[PDB]
């Protein structure tokens, strides 16, 4: 791993950083609230009639299991367009407050139901905001609701004094004026009843025949959930690394029981970095801490490669008892499990040091480990002999008490003339690009 980090077949004497170790999760976990009934979707998708789009009807969907697949398998209603999610995720995710908005329009006006659009249908009777999270569904209804004498009980507001707000509804029936004079009462010149009808007769041209529309406008991922996709809760587990999901909040971490007192209206807690670090469990109402699985830097300590291939490893910031628990019965980022055997393990103040043997006698610092410890390759033979990596507390210099006394002096009877080199950089290579 040091050879690949440095991109070399020969590694010089030193301590080198390498890829951080990370414990991988041992299982996946899923939690959703135990809502067992399939949602009342079909209670709108095959029903008597839908409201006139000037007075579009809004249904709240809650305390139930969504399954988009079983409805789309039944329903002749062959269309999709999404804005805040992919359709492929709708089966995976879960939702807070869910409203289906139900109405009828012409097949060519379907494009106006997208967010940010304009034209009188979008301006005067149904508006989606620029940050709409949801999808638009539509289907032709001429097979069921178009009539050759006409079905004029579908109405839309052609006139309004100003463009309406997102998710406002307007059922006012007072007259409207394009002439500048007060056209009071029931009519006037250039003045109008504000609602019109659709010429839905089966022999019409394409895109004028009736389309039934439903817009789903769900909130998701940051508030207590009431409608979930159809996947199944697992058991809960604690003190172990897992791929959790709570209410659609995917993440890898270790769960733990918490004393963070979430108030009744809360569902998630977050850190200064805007990430979820606690979450109340949707099945049993307790708060769980979320911590990232155990990880840290890995430093490799080597003599020069042309001196030897044996190396020691420092797991920086890690308590030594953690490394025997980091045993490769599961996956870890470093695949080279063999260092886990230990027997010569030392807890330095800088981290758990493995493969170097700690010795009681000091030396000059050869490779710096940290916090007063250094490591070196030498023949450990104080008492057949072999080279190994030792670790030691560094010497500062020779011990020397001074023979001071209140009337003693030392004076040199001779001298040495010594010549010493000192080397200083003056320049670096000029470069142009």
């Amino acid at each position: 791993e040091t050879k690949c980090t440095l991109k070399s077949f020969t590694v010089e004497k030193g301590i080198y950083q390498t890829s951080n170790f990370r414990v991988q999760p041992t299982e996946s976990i899923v939690r959703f609230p135990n809502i067992t009934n399939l949602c009342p979707f079909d209670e709108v998708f095959n029903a008597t009639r839908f409201a006139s789009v000037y007075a579009w009807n809004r249904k709240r969907i809650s305390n139930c299991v969504a399954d988009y697949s079983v409805l789309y398998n039944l329903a002749p209603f062959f269309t999709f367009k999404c804005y805040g999610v992919s359709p492929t995720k709708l089966n995976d995710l879960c939702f807070t407050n869910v409203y289906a908005d139900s109405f009828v329009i012409r097949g060519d006006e379907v494009r106006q139901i997208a967010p940010g659009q304009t034209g009188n249908i979008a301006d005067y009777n149904y508006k989606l905001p620029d940050d709409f999270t949801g999808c638009v569904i539509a289907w032709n209804s001429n097979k069921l609701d178009s009539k050759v004498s006409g079905n004029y009980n579908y109405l839309y507001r052609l006139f309004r004094k100003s463009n309406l707000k997102p998710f406002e509804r307007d059922i006012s029936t007072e007259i409207y004026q394009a002439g500048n004079k007060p056209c009071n009462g029931v009519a006037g010149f250039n003045c109008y009843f504000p609602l019109r009808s659709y010429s839905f007769r089966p022999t019409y041209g394409v895109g004028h025949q009736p389309y039934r529309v439903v817009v789903l406008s769900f909130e998701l991922l940051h508030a207590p959930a009431t409608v979930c996709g159809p996947k199944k809760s697992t058991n809960l587990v604690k003190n172990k690394c897992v791929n959790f999901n709570f209410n659609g909040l995917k993440g890898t971490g270790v769960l733990t029981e918490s004393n963070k007192k979430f108030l009744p209206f809360q569902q998630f807690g977050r850190d200064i970095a805007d990430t979820t670090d606690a979450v109340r469990d949707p099945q049993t109402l307790e708060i769980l801490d979320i911590t990232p699985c155990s990880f840290g830097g890995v430093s490799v300590i080597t003599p020069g490669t042309n001196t030897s291939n044996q190396v020691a490893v420092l797991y920086q910031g890690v308590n030594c008892t953690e490394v025997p628990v980091a045993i490769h019965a599961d996956q870890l980022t470093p695949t080279w499990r063999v260092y886990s055997t230990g027997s010569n393990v030392f807890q330095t103040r800088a981290g758990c040091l493995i493969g170097a043997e700690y010795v009681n006698n000091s030396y000059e610092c050869d490779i710096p480990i940290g916090a007063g410890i250094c490591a070196s390759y030498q023949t450990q033979t104080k008492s057949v002999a072999s080279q190994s990596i030792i670790a030691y507390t560094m010497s500062l210099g020779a011990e020397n008490s001074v023979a001071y006394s209140n009337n003693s002096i030392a004076i040199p009877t001779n001298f040495t003339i010594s010549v010493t080199t000192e080397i200083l950089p003056v320049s670096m290579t000029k470069t142009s690009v």
Binding site: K250, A273, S294, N319, T321, L396, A398, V402
Partner: protein, 342 residues
């Protein structure tokens, strides 16, 4: 860890990061370059003696009272009285002490900011020279100075009586050595009183070690900013990396994620540049501090105002968190009379 900072616990973000590759390795190499410089700075300043001098058990020095700048053997840490004040003025954040995880999680996870930085892959590494080994080098420089004067700088330490060392100093400032011996009890009482005022100042006022606290506050501020930058949306749909992969297809999730990758990678590049510029400023201070160790502790300097306001006599080094404190001793002329001259 650029991978855990940019792509916090995400597999698929880590595979998009590799399209940049070498960009993270430049950051790792640059921060490792700064980290080795800190140990080198500390060696240049403190390891100016190849022998560890001890002071003798008879603590008498012509009436000068070093008992508050020398080690006190009774303390578990072998620092002096004045060093044990200095270590309380500078409130540190994380000396790289290992976290046994149970100290990171639970109650402490609610309020401690060091564990929160670590969970974003930002780690403070320990110095090679611990505060006890810096206290030992500082004791060696001081024991050398009070028992042997400048001589331990130029060769082997040669003993001299401390009042005869002070006479050599007085000749150094152009005052004839009889002016020491005729006034030795006064010169000692003045020095002992002046050392007493160092403890009083450092025990009384907070606004003294600001030059060292500012270095801790700059690193703490720069990491708190770098943690807070993870909140930035960079024009993506969200900050939360999971909430993008949980809501989009691999074709346009890659547009929402590449923004967060670009913005977070630029945030690390800014931190490393800001750290290199400070490390250059700290180095310049370490080169000055090593020069003052050589010219004010290992010698007497005739340079005006280099070793404090006055004429330089002697200086005594004391360790402090991330720094050095020099107690400079200076002769200052006090009561002038007018004379006629020719």
């Amino acid at each position: 860890d650029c991978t855990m900072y940019i792509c916090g616990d995400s597999t698929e973000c880590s595979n998009l990061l590799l399209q940049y590759g070498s960009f993270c390795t430049q950051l790792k190499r640059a921060l490792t370059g700064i980290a080795v410089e800190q140990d080198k700075n500390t060696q240049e300043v403190f390891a100016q003696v190849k022998q560890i001098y001890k002071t003798p058990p008879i603590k008498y020095f012509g009436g000068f009272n070093f008992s508050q700048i020398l080690p006190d053997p009774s303390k578990p840490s072998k620092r002096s009285f004045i060093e044990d004040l200095l270590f309380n003025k500078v409130t540190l954040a994380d000396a790289g002490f290992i976290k046994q995880y149970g100290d990171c999680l639970g109650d402490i996870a609610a309020r401690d900011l060091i564990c929160a930085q670590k969970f974003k892959g930002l780690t403070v590494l320990p110095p090679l020279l611990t505060d006890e080994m810096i206290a030992q080098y500082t004791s060696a420089l001081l024991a050398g100075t009070i028992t042997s004067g400048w001589t331990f700088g130029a060769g082997a330490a040669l003993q001299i009586p401390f009042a005869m060392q002070m006479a050599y100093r007085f000749n150094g400032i152009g005052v004839t050595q009889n002016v020491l011996y005729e006034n030795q009890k006064l010169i000692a009482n003045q020095f002992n009183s002046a050392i007493g005022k160092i403890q009083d100042s450092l025990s009384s006022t907070a606004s003294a070690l600001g030059k060292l606290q500012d270095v801790v506050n700059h690193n703490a501020q720069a990491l708190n900013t770098l943690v807070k930058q993870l909140s930035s949306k960079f024009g993506a749909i969200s900050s939360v990396l999971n909430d993008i992969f949980s809501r989009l297809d691999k074709v346009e999730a890659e547009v929402q994620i590449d923004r967060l990758i670009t913005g977070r990678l630029q945030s690390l590049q800014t931190y490393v540049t800001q750290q290199l510029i400070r490390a250059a400023e700290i180095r310049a201070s370490a080169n000055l501090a090593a020069t003052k160790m050589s010219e004010c502790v290992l010698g007497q300097s005739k340079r005006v105002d280099f070793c404090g306001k006055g004429y330089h006599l002697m200086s005594f080094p004391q360790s402090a968190p991330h720094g050095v404190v020099f107690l400079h001793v200076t002769y200052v002329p006090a009561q002038e009379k007018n004379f006629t001259t020719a």
